[PDB]
Amino acid sequence: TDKERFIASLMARMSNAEKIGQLRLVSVGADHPKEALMADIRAGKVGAIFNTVTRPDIRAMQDQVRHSRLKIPLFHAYDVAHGHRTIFPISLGLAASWDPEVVARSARISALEASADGLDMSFSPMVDITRDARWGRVSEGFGEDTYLTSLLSGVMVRAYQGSNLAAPDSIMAAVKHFALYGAAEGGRDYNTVDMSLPRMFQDYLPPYKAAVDAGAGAVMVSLNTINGVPATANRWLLTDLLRQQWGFKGLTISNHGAVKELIKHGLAGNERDATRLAIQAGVDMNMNDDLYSTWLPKLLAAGEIDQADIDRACRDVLAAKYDLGLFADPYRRLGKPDDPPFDTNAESRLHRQAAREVAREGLVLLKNRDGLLPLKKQGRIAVIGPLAKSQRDVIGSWSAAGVPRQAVTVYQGLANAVGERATLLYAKGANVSGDQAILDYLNSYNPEVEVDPRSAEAMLEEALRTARDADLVVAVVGESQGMAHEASSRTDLRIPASQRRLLKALKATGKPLVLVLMNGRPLSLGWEQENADAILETWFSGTEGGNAIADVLFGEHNPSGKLTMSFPRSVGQVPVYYNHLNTGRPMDGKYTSRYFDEANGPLYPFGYGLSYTEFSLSPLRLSSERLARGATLEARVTLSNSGKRAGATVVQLYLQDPVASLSRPVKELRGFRKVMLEPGESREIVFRLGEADLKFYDSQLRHTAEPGEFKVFVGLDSAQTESRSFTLL
Amino acid sequence: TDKERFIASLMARMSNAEKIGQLRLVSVGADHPKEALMADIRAGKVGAIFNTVTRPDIRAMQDQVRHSRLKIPLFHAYDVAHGHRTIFPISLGLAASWDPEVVARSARISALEASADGLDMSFSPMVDITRDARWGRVSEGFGEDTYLTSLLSGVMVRAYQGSNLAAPDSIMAAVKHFALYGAAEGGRDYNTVDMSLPRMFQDYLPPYKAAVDAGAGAVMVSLNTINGVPATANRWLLTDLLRQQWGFKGLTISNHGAVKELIKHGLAGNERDATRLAIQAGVDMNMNDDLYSTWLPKLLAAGEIDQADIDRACRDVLAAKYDLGLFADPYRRLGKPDDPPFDTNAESRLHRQAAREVAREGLVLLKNRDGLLPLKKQGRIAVIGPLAKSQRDVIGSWSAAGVPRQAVTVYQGLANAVGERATLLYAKGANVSGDQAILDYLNSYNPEVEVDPRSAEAMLEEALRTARDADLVVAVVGESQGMAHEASSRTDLRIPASQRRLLKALKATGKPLVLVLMNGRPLSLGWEQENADAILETWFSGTEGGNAIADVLFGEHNPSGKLTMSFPRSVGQVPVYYNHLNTGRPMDGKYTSRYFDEANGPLYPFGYGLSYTEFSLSPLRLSSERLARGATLEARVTLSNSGKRAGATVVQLYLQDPVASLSRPVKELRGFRKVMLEPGESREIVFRLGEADLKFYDSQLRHTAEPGEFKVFVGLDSAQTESRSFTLL
Numbered sequence A, B: 001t002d003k004e005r006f007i008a009s010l011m012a013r014m015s016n017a018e019k020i021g022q023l024r025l026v027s028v029g030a031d032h033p034k035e036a037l038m039a040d041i042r043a044g045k046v047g048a049i050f051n052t053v054t055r056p057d058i059r060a061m062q063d064q065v066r067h068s069r070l071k072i073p074l075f076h077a078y079d080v081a082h083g084h085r086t087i088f089p090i091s092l093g094l095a096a097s098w099d100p101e102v103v104a105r106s107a108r109i110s111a112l113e114a115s116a117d118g119l120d121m122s123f124s125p126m127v128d129i130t131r132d133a134r135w136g137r138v139s140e141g142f143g144e145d146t147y148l149t150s151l152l153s154g155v156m157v158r159a160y161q162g163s164n165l166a167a168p169d170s171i172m173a174a175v176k177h178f179a180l181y182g183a184a185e186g187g188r189d190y191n192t193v194d195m196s197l198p199r200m201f202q203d204y205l206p207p208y209k210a211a212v213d214a215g216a217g218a219v220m221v222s223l224n225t226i227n228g229v230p231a232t233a234n235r236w237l238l239t240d241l242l243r244q245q246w247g248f249k250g251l252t253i254s255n256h257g258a259v260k261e262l263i264k265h266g267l268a269g270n271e272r273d274a275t276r277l278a279i280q281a282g283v284d285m286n287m288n289d290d291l292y293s294t295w296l297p298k299l300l301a302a303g304e305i306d307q308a309d310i311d312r313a314c315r316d317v318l319a320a321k322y323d324l325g326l327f328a329d330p331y332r333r334l335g336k337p338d339d340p341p342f343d344t345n346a347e348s349r350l351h352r353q354a355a356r357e358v359a360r361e362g363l364v365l366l367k368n369r370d371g372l373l374p375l376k377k378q379g380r381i382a383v384i385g386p387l388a389k390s391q392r393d394v395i396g397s398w399s400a401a402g403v404p405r406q407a408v409t410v411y412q413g414l415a416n417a418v419g420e421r422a423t424l425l426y427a428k429g430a431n432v433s434g435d436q437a438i439l440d441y442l443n444s445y446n447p448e449v450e451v452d453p454r455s456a457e458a459m460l461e462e463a464l465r466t467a468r469d470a471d472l473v474v475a476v477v478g479e480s481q482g483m484a485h486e487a488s489s490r491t492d493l494r495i496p497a498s499q500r501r502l503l504k505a506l507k508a509t510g511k512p513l514v515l516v517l518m519n520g521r522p523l524s525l526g527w528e529q530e531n532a533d534a535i536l537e538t539w540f541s542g543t544e545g546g547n548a549i550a551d552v553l554f555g556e557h558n559p560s561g562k563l564t565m566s567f568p569r570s571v572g573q574v575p576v577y578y579n580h581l582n583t584g585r586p587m588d589g590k591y592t593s594r595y596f597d598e599a600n601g602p603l604y605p606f607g608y609g610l611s612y613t614e615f616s617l618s619p620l621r622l623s624s625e626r627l628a629r630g631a632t633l634e635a636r637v638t639l640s641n642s643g644k645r646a647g648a649t650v651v652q653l654y655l656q657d658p659v660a661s662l663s664r665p666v667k668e669l670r671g672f673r674k675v676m677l678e679p680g681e682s683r684e685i686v687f688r689l690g691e692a693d694l695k696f697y698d699s700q701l702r703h704t705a706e707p708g709e710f711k712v713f714v715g716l717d718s719a720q721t722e723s724r725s726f727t728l729l
């Protein structure tokens, strides 16, 4: 009522010109030069800013608000995806921690730094489910699993927003991309999404819903068609589902140029009609293309739009500014005037300890033949590969205000660890790619890839001479961050050919070979799994990446990360995911659902990851054989560290509904516990399962649990499990 | 009414035991030994037989019917997919004729031979739309296009059934696989199908509907889930759509073991429940697993199914036998007792002339650098490759009663063409595969691949010496038919590595290189398109394949075939198809829908194919710029043969609806004309477009044409076109 009073009196004052100006979301660019933008803010024609990210710059913009009749403050947004200035691992690496508190910590520090620079909103978290490793943006999400992505979706929102959206160290979450953006056909960015409603409700929508139920202040709408209707023009998605069914009360934001793109989708013949479709579907705020400002007045005057369409959009912008505390104090995130100036990028405003501890948790040990890892800080260590000394790659895609020169490379991380106790020998070995067309693509906007002008053969000969002079080879190989970016979809999932040629030459020297992988998507690693002695998955591990990688390689931290996305044997197996249907003819002979020209199944399954120690699970026990409606059941198992080193693992609870009105998955994740144990230590793990855990969407979207058998599986990954059954009454 | 009266009086006489026995469809095998099967027919416990394919054998079975109380005759079925004894090109090759009359001719001759052997029914045509080249069964269909597959669906049914199903030279069509079988996830056979209802009705269902509207007597139900519900248990598909909405009056047949497989799908806990789900969904007839015989009496007595369920299934079997003339005369397709015996496989019962003329029409010329084709009947011709002398491969998969020793190989076809006027030099060059696991798979049941015991290197050095002694190299390469079979899904679309190694060695000799491809799916041909001088796509061209291939290679027939399925550049681009959506960011730079690591688009588009002559199109003319509802529009263009040889091409009419309430394809096929022209000859081509051509299914399945612009394209393929607009009023 108090908020409603302030907001209703303010909107009673406003002209349509002022209401429509609140819907304009812009950035300083060629589209909107700084001084023209300043004039537009003075004239009341701007609602919010993105990509202006420092206190002085945001202050100068907020200072123009004084010259408007109503003095409605701006909010300031940015893409703080996995860090603002202190860069954490990419989301796919954070997910691999299997630890909500580690992810929450990355989010809280991101919000602290962003809010310290004056930012009120992040276009995050990205909660799109990804089953297609070809898509460039899988790096930005939490992998293939609905339960895990849904849990981390809520965690990110609560950690960004705190208990109070007005707090100077809180930012608003704009959850993206609503919806289904990750299921693009062919894994080609922006491409067609087509799926049944039961799959959509069961597998793809719950993460957006968790963000809404966690109190997300905003929702960013996606660029893709859903079943033939672009999200930006999809009333069924933005009004019926998001508002009426889920009760979302916040702000909807279109993606960059999305209203105008309704023309190229063939939903609209002109910008006037595109604008009508977007506002009536339920898009409040319009990013960069300015069609709302250009066309809403004419649409309203012609009776094509209703006043209520303008009023609803405007109300959502004002309610967001109110909740962010910006009517109370527009400078609340910008300090007091006469606070002394600072270097935005000062070393003292970073959080290196938080970045290092988080980065350690996401590293996944994929292979370790004969205890080669951990390494001893001694002897001669060859560090070879195009990513060994790469500052720009270790902070990954969507590195926000991250500064490459402030990042710790793998080489530098190893140098910091050994000091004088061991000798590092360096050789680039190869360029990230040997294909000139792929280098032209990676270098097309900014210099992202250091191209060594020497021949491939000369770099190899140097690498082989370096390996020969060492006790063992740490090969730092994989993708540059520009390969797992928006619009950077891949037809091949292997390590690039220039680097595989290097690895083959390194193998033939007979030296022990440790692979340190940098990559923003699942890679095809058949040759590496056969021929490398050890493999460490490091994703893009952030500002402190190299230090956290050295901490695991030398045994300071025992690798605890587990995969949250299945690793295909090749691109021709796509899609592969752990929660698939059985079919009528599952492969364990010939007449089964399989390929004939390659081994079947993923190379590494969902939830896979090794340790320097060994863990054991006692038999799974259920607290009863039968479960009454309204009752809870307990699944009990004892986890023991039966090896020589302290270490964490992740105990995973899976569920199967083997008889149902729909064909249900062979298994679905329904719980986990990350557990840190000393040698010989045990922990009794108790999972609680109720009827809520057993429901699914039928063909008419009835969300019900049916009577009958459920199988419960517990294990340290999605493959290596045992099951016990109970009956729901 | 006469039919209704005959069938109602017969079913009034029948016990449930006799009604349920009519639902049993069996074959002689280990599951059902001959003499036990004979006794079951005598006892009235068998409805129909499959895989018994000679007159004496079918007669012996029909002779047992006398011993039953009611003497209800059997029908006899077989998989006559692309020929019975005289084998035509695989369906994907027949589709490439772009000529309904050529396809009708292959179907009519198939029915003539099958009916001459006593068969009443073929499990054909297969009308599944296929956009995923990995799937093993794309060989069995007509490619990726809804309009073309729908047209050929009706053509096949009318050609099999004639105007009279009782005629002794007619067979019943059982259209398959109802439904969506070709959209399996990952292109893995039997795998999950998930799609929106608008896409299902717009793109996938029309071919089954065309079969039903053409009077198909039966429908074979598919093995896949549709949106979580197996087809065999899918009441929405088999009752609501097929019976109530489409008014199908004929027979439904389950696939082999499909009812029992409902347990592995997780729709049923036991065989009793699987049986209930199948009969109540609307499966009439049960192939080989015998659950109907085992369980229907107990299901009925317990009130779990209704008498009406048994009565409806039984009635459909009796109505099928009645329409096939089997109550009037059960021997109508089996001759008289007086008839003299014959050799079923006599050379005089074949139709070589029809198979040769059909096979010529499907061959697609993909590349011809500098007029290398046609070849002259002179000089020295090297014939090299594992498929050059392959009889088993040229007749393709699903070769019914085809005899490989009666087939004409490419080598033999070339020998028959040159006689003494030129010298052929033969060298195998390589085995079909160099991977022992792939050879074990292809050779697992019968010897399908002749494995040359010599080393790869020894075969190469013999091939290179043969090339060096010749004027040019005809390399006969591709897949064995067992690679494009049921359950033979591929993760790689290139020619096998043993053969690519051979092709590379052949390229390095400098000799002119003609590639003759045998394959049952689109192949990835990037290297071949760059390095071969000529490329001829021959699919698997049947019993007279080698003669038809020689007829095109030596210029007797001017290549006229055009692709009906897009050829991907690599497996990592799947799916690619011509009738895709534009997206919001079509590729004409970086922020578009594309891959960065490979050239974009298909290597060869839908409707692509070259000629030994050159054709030109005059500018497209529309009969008016505006079109009243209920009125017809004319699209006119003049085709000229502006080159030196008689030859045919295919003029293709495409439509775009660029503003619609759903995002509509960049292009959809809406007509074509195959035109044969002498040099210097012209023909004015007139296409008729009406309102039915302009409709689409919206989000609520409203099937309407919306007022506004339509773009009309005419060209010789889906890429190289010119467009004009009209407005629907």
Ligand SMILES: OC[C@H]1O[C@@H](O[C@@H]2[C@@H](O)[C@H](O[C@@H]3[C@@H](O)[C@H](O)O[C@H](CO)[C@H]3O)O[C@H](CO)[C@H]2O)[C@H](O)[C@@H](O)[C@@H]1O
Pocket (backbone or CB within 6 Å): A591, B050, B078, B079, B123, B176, B220, B255, B256, B257, B486
């Ligand atoms: O002509 C009939 C029909 O055949 C179908 O293909 C079948 C396969 O589905 C079948 O697979 C077997 C199982 O159904 C059976 O119960 O078990 C064994 C393993 O023990 C499987 O091999 O195999 C036969 C081969 O004889 C195939 O014909 C086609 O899908 C369909 O198109 C065709 O009309």
Ligand SMILES: OC[C@H]1O[C@@H](O[C@@H]2[C@@H](O)[C@H](O)O[C@H](CO)[C@H]2O)[C@H](O)[C@@H](O)[C@@H]1O
Pocket (backbone or CB within 6 Å): A050, A078, A079, A123, A176, A220, A255, A256, A257, A486, B591
């Ligand atoms: O920061 C706002 C949103 O930006 C989107 O990326 C932009 C492209 O769509 C646009 O066309 O080009 C620029 C490159 O200069 C990109 O910033 C993302 O898709 C969104 O996630 C992001 O929130």
Ligand SMILES: [Mg+2]
Pocket (backbone or CB within 6 Å): A657, A658, A659, A660, A706, A707, A708, A709
């Ligand atoms: Mg159940």
Ligand SMILES: [Mg+2]
Pocket (backbone or CB within 6 Å): B657, B658, B659, B660, B706, B707, B708, B709
């Ligand atoms: Mg239109």
